[PDB]
Design a binder for this molecule. Structure first.
Ligand code: JGK
Length: 116
């Protein structure tokens, strides 16, 4: 894979991550890792093998852990897929996940087009 400059990835992709943070209350379940003890859901790590959340993605962006932009896009979708997998279709977190995924699709859209 071709490697991008971490500072360049941050400048192109961080605004799309901040667009998710701005969603209130839709982003609230996603701003910190799922704490199954705090939330009363002990089976969470039985079902979600690769947890992901906004804070981890932001950390990976801030410390240059992504070599190329589709790794960022992979983590965002991992975050959303975890939530669609774990939560019931009738629940508020599922709805929030679908709202947030919509905002993301709009934003990531011209950004990846400008990185090619
Ligand atoms: C039992 C349901 O809770 C979840 C269930 C599943 C998931 C995911 C991602 O699969 C997230 C939350 C969740 C929801 C919220 N926020 C809500 O608004 C909410 C919860 C319930 C009613 O409203 C905040 C947090 C959270 C966090 N990430 N860090 O501290 C806290 C507190 C987590």
């Amino acid at each position: 894979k071709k490697i991008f400059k971490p500072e360049e990835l941050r400048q192109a992709l961080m605004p799309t991550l901040e667009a998710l943070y701005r969603q209130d209350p839709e982003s609230l379940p996603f701003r910190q890792p799922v704490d199954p003890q705090l939330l009363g859901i002990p089976d969470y790590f039985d079902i979600v093998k690769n947890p992901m959340d906004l804070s981890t993605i932001k950390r990976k962006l801030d410390t240059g852990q992504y070599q190329e932009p589709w790794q960022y896009v992979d983590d965002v979708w991992l975050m959303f897929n975890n939530a669609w997998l774990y939560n019931r279709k009738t629940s508020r977190v599922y709805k929030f996940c679908s709202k947030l995924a919509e905002v993301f699709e709009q934003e990531i859209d011209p950004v990846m087009q400008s990185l090619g």
